[PDB]
Design a protein around this ligand. Structure first.
Ligand SMILES: [K+]
Ligand SMILES: [K+]
Length: 327
DNA sequence: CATTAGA
DNA sequence: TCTAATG
């Protein structure tokens, strides 16, 4: 957590590099299990050799550990850090819709900057265009105070369209968080569950609502179960317009809400931990259901869930307010 | 790890 | 169809 920090930090830098700038999925994966292992190890690595006794730790890596230990740096890291192409790729990637593969291509063609991207809007796809168009606001945080104004509107049209809808704004928002990165709305309807052959409209109706009133301003992607968009709070009585915000809406079979909701509320650890516990408690939890364990090794058969509680009860734990689902 | 665009 | 990108 801190005794082998520089090593893990260096290592992740290393990995991340092979993956993006290079297409070394392998080296990439290498730097990672290592970074992973050296992290668990309870003692200060004092030499590569020492490191090296680890699993995943080879001669390539170990050598890097000495250099890093010896001198507070690493050239390869220093060289990459300087590297314009590579820098370039790192940046392009910040554009929503740009991933490594496109980043490399764009660079290939010579589009290394924001302005470059501009002049060539033609080379970009809708998603990419939008991300470009909203590069600044996409990077901005979402203050809760706004999260509250967003949730407000959201729940309103949802209700207006059909009163039978159930929505929840998940994520760290749900967990307290002073601010968030984007808004995550989980959606369901009684009329749609595991079997009940869809109702694509179910999603459509609301997107259309939100649009109708200008909550929604763009669409990155719209499918029959997962809508990914851009939204904006009504710019008041002027002098202050709001930044464009990423919003994601998802349809869910009512019969899988709460687990979905559980899960997406996190946190990453609260989850893992509650989950680890359902294992002892003779269960299995995951984004959609909660099945009881069977001695033979594994088992099935989804237990019925009508609330976050059902799940809690089941693993015979203390209902944890989302506020304190921190870990 | 599943859903969507796209080409 | 596959492959990329988000989450
Ligand atoms: K080893
Ligand atoms: K990106």
């Amino acid at each position: 957590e801190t005794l082998n920090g520089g090593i893990t930090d260096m290592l992740t830098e290393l990995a991340n590099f092979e993956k993006n700038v290079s297409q070394a999925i392998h080296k990439y994966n290498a730097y990672r299990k290592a970074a992973s292992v050296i992290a668990k190890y309870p003692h200060k690595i004092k030499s590569g050799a020492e490191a090296k006794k680890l699993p995943g730790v080879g001669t390539k890596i170990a050598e890097k550990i000495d250099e890093f230990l010896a001198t507070g740096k690493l050239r390869k890291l220093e060289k990459i850090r300087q590297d314009d192409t590579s820098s370039s790729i790192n940046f392009l990637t910040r554009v929503s819709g740009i991933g490594p593969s496109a980043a490399r291509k764009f660079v290939d063609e010579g589009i290394k900057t924001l302005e470059d991207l501009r002049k060539n809007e033609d080379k970009l796809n809708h998603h990419q265009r939008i991300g470009l168009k909203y590069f600044g606001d996409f990077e901005k945080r979402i203050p809760r105070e706004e999260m509250l104004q967003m949730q407000d509107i959201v729940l309103n049209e949802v209700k207006k369209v059909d009163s039978e809808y159930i929505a929840t704004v998940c994520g760290s928002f749900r967990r307290g968080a002073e601010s968030s990165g984007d808004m995550d709305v989980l959606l369901t309807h009684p009329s749609f569950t595991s079997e009940s052959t869809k109702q694509p409209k179910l999603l459509h109706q609301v997107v259309e609502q939100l649009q109708k009133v200008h909550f929604i301003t763009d669409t990155l992607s719209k499918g029959e179960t997962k809508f990914m968009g851009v939204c904006q709070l009504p710019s008041k009585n002027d002098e202050k317009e709001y930044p464009h915000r990423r919003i994601d809406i998802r349809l869910i079979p009512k019969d899988q809400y709460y687990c979905g909701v559980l899960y997406f509320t996190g946190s990453d650890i609260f989850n893992k931990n509650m989950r680890a516990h359902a294992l002892e408690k003779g269960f299995t939890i995951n984004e959609y259901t909660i099945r009881p364990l069977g001695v033979t090794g594994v088992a099935g058969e989804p237990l019925p869930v009508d609330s976050e509680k059902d799940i809690f009860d089941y693993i015979q734990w203390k209902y944890r307010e989302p506020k304190d689902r921190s870990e």
